């Protein structure tokens, strides 16, 4: 016989006759494999990039503006890792380019970009 249900703090207790209680406080194996996520600095700087407005159907927060770019994550990864390659290439193809020099008309700008 075995028993196991999910915790409020989504994690699992199972029969375990090796502890003291007769159960095991198991930290559920997280699929989330990406180091900088567990460091709270990343999250702070990431909130710095957002504009939160209350909803038009309730007072709960939801994002109105985001300035997140594939670019931004790159500081938190090794330039050698394949991950870094993914995020970089993604930046190159998707993040907006800026062209600082003024251009005669705007279709030109588009061409330069």
């Amino acid at each position: 016989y075995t028993f196991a249900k999910f915790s409020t703090g989504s994690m699992l207790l199972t029969k375990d006759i090796v502890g003291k209680s007769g159960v095991s406080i198991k930290r559920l194996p997280t699929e989330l494999q990406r180091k900088f996520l567990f460091d709270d600095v990343y999250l702070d700087k990431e909130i710095e990039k957002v504009t939160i407005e209350a909803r038009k159907s309730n007072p709960y927060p939801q994002i109105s503006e985001s300035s997140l770019l594939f670019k931004d994550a790159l500081d938190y990864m090794e330039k050698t890792s394949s991950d870094y390659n993914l995020w970089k290439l993604s930046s190159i193809l998707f993040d907006p380019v800026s062209y600082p020099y003024k251009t005669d008309n705007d279709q030109v700008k588009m061409a330069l970009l």
């Binding site: 997280t30 989330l32 996520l37 600095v41 999250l43 309730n58 007072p59 709960y60 939801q62 997140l68």
Partner: protein
């Protein structure tokens, strides 16, 4: 048809992880770069928020949960998590900016009220249960402040009793008796009323007002 392909890519491979897929969808959304269904963006967002919550990263899961389009779901997810996990979400300033996302004043204090009832507050309540709080309280200045808060908000029996204490008398008495009937706190209140009446006394009207506690009543008679 990025989305079309994205959906195709989803069912074929796992090369794109939960986090990446969410980040991608969000960037493209907020930069006009591309278009995704409210539902696909929410799907991605749910998945990542969940992974995060499995990682005991509640602040971060909370932040992600906000990119939900469906207001109903956002409400539920957010609420549920904040109330369940309020303690951890109130440590540093990096946790403060968190609860200064725009977490509703109500939700935050409400959650915090729950955490107090369960660990065995009053300002939050001021901002049934009220009767139980009055029960726990059973000083004069605190009573006056409570009365002021009640007036601002504007149970009735308790109010009458408070008004009498700060200071028709028979009506207040009947109200208090009814409240007592509605256990320890009620008995305490009854004893207090008795003491107050005794202080006031220090003939027919007095007899009307009158009509261990038993021993006291006997000594009185």
């Amino acid at each position: 048809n990025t989305e079309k392909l994205y959906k195709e890519v989803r069912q074929r491979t796992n090369a794109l992880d939960v986090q990446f897929c969410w980040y991608l969808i969000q960037t493209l959304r907020f930069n006009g770069t591309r278009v995704f269904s409210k539902e696909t963006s929410d799907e991605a967002t749910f998945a990542f928020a969940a992974q995060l919550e499995f990682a005991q990263l509640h602040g971060h899961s909370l932040f992600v949960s906000c990119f939900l389009n469906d207001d109903k779901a956002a409400e539920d997810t957010i609420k549920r998590l904040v109330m369940r996990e309020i303690t951890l979400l109130r440590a540093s300033t990096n946790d403060h900016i968190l609860n200064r996302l725009k977490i509703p004043s109500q939700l935050i204090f409400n959650a915090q009220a729950l955490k107090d009832r369960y660990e065995g507050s009053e300002v939050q309540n001021l901002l049934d249960l009220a009767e139980m709080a009055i029960v726990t309280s059973l000083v004069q200045n605190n009573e006056l402040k409570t009365l002021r808060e009640i007036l601002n908000e504007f149970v009735s029996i308790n109010v009458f009793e408070v008004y009498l204490k700060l200071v028709q008398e028979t009506i207040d008495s009947l109200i208090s008796g009814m409240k007592i009937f509605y256990v320890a706190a009620c008995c305490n209140v009854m004893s207090q009323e008795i003491v107050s009446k005794i202080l006031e006394k220090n003939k027919a009207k007095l007899l009307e007002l009158p009509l261990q506690d038993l021993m006291k009543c006997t000594y009185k008679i």
